[PDB]
Design a protein around this ligand. Structure first.
Ligand SMILES: Cc1cc2nc3c(=O)[nH]c(=O)nc-3n(C[C@H](O)[C@H](O)[C@H](O)COP(=O)(O)O)c2cc1C
Ligand SMILES: Cc1cc2nc3c(=O)[nH]c(=O)nc-3n(C[C@H](O)[C@H](O)[C@H](O)COP(=O)(O)O)c2cc1C
Lengths: 191, 191
């Protein structure tokens, strides 16, 4: 329902860190609305080289344990503190949408362009989440690459996870981080 | 031109370069479009991208070059196919090249700096749309052909994220089919 001009939004959009991410999450219906909106990205060849996996409820707690398991079998036993990170890897926010790339050899489309799309679809999710009243963090901790975890959540060898998008509410004021300067990144030609 | 974010996410449509028109953004307006576009998620805050803004005459110089290389390749293409090439960059007032500059970092995977480039291209479209300009995200032979890349100064450690053609549009674009959530999203857990 809530309104924000597009221009004011681009000037102010700021991610919220997963810890700062409180409850409530969104209803399955709100969430369907967010994705129905995110899958409206540029996609050369009209291929939809991505897929989403929505994690919410108790199953987050169960995954974070699969992640705690793998993590220790990885490193016998170090800091108990770090072990909490793994217990709450997926429970810091109410919902976590995993954005999987499913890019592969195509007869006309380069996996590069199919990858640029998943790049863009990840921002379109953050865009739909903020526009829908929620705050978002786009992570990919080791869980994105560690093959013992990737198997436990169903992303194959032929796929790469693009990001885990934690969605929630928050009571925390956005603070700005340093941005790139245009003398440093943009370059002009012709007038 | 004062549009709201939620409605915007529902109607957002690329209009093709071919039907993009004069006037484009002033250097002023372009600077803001990019000042706005470089605020993207970006692990390691290392800005793995750069932009090149092709305007006015150097657009013809470049299209002219495309055609030269497209004749070196195949010295007998129709006066039609030649037209297209001497037209590549003169379809829209402005053309902004987004370049990925991803190299091995010591903490940030190259994959995550590529995700950020995809992000940045949409973000530019958002900034351009938000400023009253249509925009089409192209990448044709000219994004991958090493002959041409060398004339525009895109190194070997670099790849072109896309050529974002930006201009003014008279009528809104017709929508195209989007994915069915049923096909592209699976749900895990309940509440
Ligand atoms: C990385 C990337 C490269 C693309 N290159 C082309 C191209 O060379 N020619 C073309 O007709 N469309 C190309 N497209 C598709 C267009 O941008 C098309 O306008 C877009 O898919 C429509 O998306 P929209 O309706 O959500 O705005 C590309 C899309 C992406 C993400
Ligand atoms: C593909 C990708 C993976 C990321 N993974 C992490 C992570 O595992 N941990 C972390 O503290 N930040 C991570 N980040 C950075 C953030 O998302 C951070 O919110 C971003 O740099 C903030 O940009 P913004 O203030 O314009 O929203 C990642 C960014 C991208 C594009």
């Amino acid at each position: 329902t809530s309104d924000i001009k597009l221009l004011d939004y681009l000037r102010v959009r700021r991610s919220t860190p997963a810890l700062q991410l409180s409850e409530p999450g969104p209803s399955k219906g709100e969430i369907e609305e967010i994705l129905r909106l995110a899958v409206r990205v540029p996609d050369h060849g009209k291929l939809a080289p991505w897929r989403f996996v929505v994690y919410r409820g108790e199953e987050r707690v169960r995954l974070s344990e699969a992640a705690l398991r793998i993590a220790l079998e990885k490193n016998p036993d170090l800091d108990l503190q770090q072990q909490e990170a793994e217990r709450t890897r997926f429970t810091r926010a109410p919902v976590v949408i995993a954005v999987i790339s499913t890019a592969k050899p195509h007869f006309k489309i380069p996996e590069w362009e199919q990858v640029m799309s998943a790049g863009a679809v990840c921002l379109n999710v953050i865009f739909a989440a903020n526009a829908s009243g929620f705050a978002a963090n786009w992570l990919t901790e080791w869980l994105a690459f560690d093959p013992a975890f990737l198997a436990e959540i169903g992303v194959s060898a032929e796929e790469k996870v693009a990001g885990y998008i934690h969605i929630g509410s928050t009571t925390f004021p956005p603070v700005e981080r340093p941005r790139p300067e245009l003398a440093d990144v943009v370059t002009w030609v012709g007038d």
